[PDB]
């Protein structure tokens, strides 16, 4: 296997740039082709980033690519190391997001942040180095879910009604931080995802058993608690012995319901890339296991 990747800079390496790059050692950068030797253009997302077109497209392009770690550099030579599944590695936090002990990580395209004054790395000519965001599971799942919600809600509505909802949706608060999705324009990829979501939602609506349909009504009649009060408050606009009980048919129907819900979940959950051990107290670096 190509356990090492060499990249060569065509431009001259001034002392400031090489020192700055030396500070980035052991960070995470993606590489498209996995080929043994690669030019400096493909290192980073700058070749593919385009604010005019979908953030969904950039999300897909990022999730398709491969992940690598950084190594110390020398004259005109920068060394990249591909991780092997199951081993233990050291990574540095590229974004400002806080990291916590014992939760998974995901990779996502960069996000707008409070000051908007993002630091520029290795701006060699018209080319620039930009890193992907390594994000813990709740924030990444929340942002992907809310992007899908944007796509599903905004369709077939005028800009006026959409204007308040997008300002409510776009802002994400996560563990005392604030974030905003750069460019949530609808794209054909989002339409395919939405078509699959609609099919799965209708299927689970259909094949759900009677007990599952009537469960919350019976319990709301029976009990009363804050969770049930909230559920009824949600369903208020919409709002006996079962004549048939069949354990085997119920088992099969619930298995079908699980395959449907399993499919619907895959639309949201991005693939894990890292699982963490305990983190340095400065929130800048962590030691993690890599998964493929």
């Amino acid at each position: 296997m190509e356990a090492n990747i060499f990249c060569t800079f065509d431009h001259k390496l001034s002392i400031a740039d090489v020192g700055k790059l030396t500070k980035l050692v052991a960070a995470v950068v993606p590489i498209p082709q996995r080929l043994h030797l690669i030019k400096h253009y493909q290192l980073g997302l700058h070749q593919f980033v385009d604010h005019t077109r979908g953030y969904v497209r950039l999300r897909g392009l990022l999730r398709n690519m491969t992940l690598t770690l950084m190594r110390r550099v020398e004259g005109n030579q920068i060394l990249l190391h591909v991780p092997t599944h199951g081993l233990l590695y050291t990574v540095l936090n590229t974004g400002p997001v806080t990291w916590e002990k014992g939760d998974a990580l995901c990779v996502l395209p960069p996000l707008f942040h409070g000051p908007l004054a993002r630091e520029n790395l290795l701006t060699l000519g018209q080319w620039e180095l930009v890193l992907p965001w390594i994000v813990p599971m709740p924030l990444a799942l929340e942002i992907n879910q809310r992007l899908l919600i944007m796509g599903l809600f905004s369709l077939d509505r005028s800009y006026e009604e959409v204007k308040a909802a997008v300002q409510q949706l776009q802002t994400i608060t996560f563990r005392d931080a604030t974030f905003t999705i750069p460019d949530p324009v609808i794209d054909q990829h989002l339409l395919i995802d939405m078509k699959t979501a609609c099919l799965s939602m209708s299927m689970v609506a259909n094949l759900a058993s009677e007990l599952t349909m009537t469960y919350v009504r019976k319990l709301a009649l029976e009990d009363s608690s804050m969770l049930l009060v909230k559920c009824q408050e949600l369903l208020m606009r919409l709002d006996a012995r079962p004549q048939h009980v069949s354990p085997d048919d119920e088992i099969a129907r619930l298995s079908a319901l699980f395959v449907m819900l399993r499919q619907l979940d895959d639309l949201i959950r991005e693939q894990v890339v890292f699982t963490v051990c305990d983190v340095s107290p400065d929130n800048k670096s962590a030691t993690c296991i890599f998964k493929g």
Binding site: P32, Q33, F48, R57, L61, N64
Partner: protein, 49 residues
């Protein structure tokens, strides 16, 4: 008329390009397959304006 033109010249049926992600993964399609035999050298690409 499209089919009739495809028959008139010795050209194959049209073929869709690869998508964005696959185009980024794979480095080229090489649609014109290698010929069976060649005594003369590399086929000189003659373009017309």
């Amino acid at each position: 008329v499209d089919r009739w033109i495809r028959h008139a010249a010795g050209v194959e049926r049209p073929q869709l390009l690869d998508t964005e992600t696959i185009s980024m993964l794979t480095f080229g399609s090489m649609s014109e397959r290698n010929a069976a035999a060649t005594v003369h050298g590399q086929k000189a690409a003659c373009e017309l304006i």
